[PDB]
Write a protein that binds this ligand. Sequence first.
Ligand code: YR3
Lengths: 9, 241
Amino acid sequence: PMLMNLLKD
Amino acid sequence: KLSEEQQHIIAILLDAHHKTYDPTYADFRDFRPPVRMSPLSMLPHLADLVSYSIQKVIGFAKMIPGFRDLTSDDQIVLLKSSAIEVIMLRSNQSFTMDDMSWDCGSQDYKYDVTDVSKAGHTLELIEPLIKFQVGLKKLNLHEEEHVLLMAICIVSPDRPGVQDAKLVEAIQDRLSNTLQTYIRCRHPPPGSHQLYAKMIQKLADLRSLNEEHSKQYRSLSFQPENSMKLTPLVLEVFGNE
Ligand SMILES: CCC(CC)(c1ccc(OC[C@@H](O)CO)c(C)c1)c1ccc(OC[C@H](O)C(C)(C)C)c(C)c1
């Protein structure tokens, strides 16, 4: 989801 | 003194806040309109307000020194559990002590206790929330103390589900030590007296507000007509499994 995808890196 | 590392932490946090907090409130025109004339008439507008605020909390958290070194899982845990608290903190900057309202630059975007109730909340949350804002405003924090407090709030090792609680605590204590040194170095008496302890108590009060918010949110969002008015990001961050 969106949180995880924004934090990815 | 404030060490070079501590002064660097503060500069990074200040820039992060400046980059994620628009004191002109320009973007608010794009939110669904406030409707005040219940049915929950402020729910669409305050959902968009909160959804926008969550995006800014994430952008702020990303820049907290150390936050990037936590696992994805721990980063998500910390953001989901703290988002509402940081939004309550960050709202203090528009809060006006006199009439107990949040002034976001426009007559339409001056929010009061009735507005919040028209998103489905009751005075069981709203009254303690106002008392929090008032008490926080009376601390007369400098911007450095404000952004340190938000960062400390985010990096809390006691949050439900944190895996590397040791690393989270180490990052938090670095920030707390920066704060305590800033207060010792810069904050004048009498405002500086027991200031750190007062600030820590505000974080305790925030857990209480978080619990009451989450209860009320769980109830209101269980109604499909309400849930339908919430943004996917609010639904994920205040909800998910
Ligand atoms: C209107 C006051 C307030 C205070 C934190 C708020 C939030 C964000 C914000 O913005 C401040 C900064 O982020 C501006 O960039 C400003 C000024 C005020 C708020 C708002 C909504 C609220 O409830 C929402 C519901 O739970 C919902 C069902 C829609 C999820 C609550 C309890 C409080």
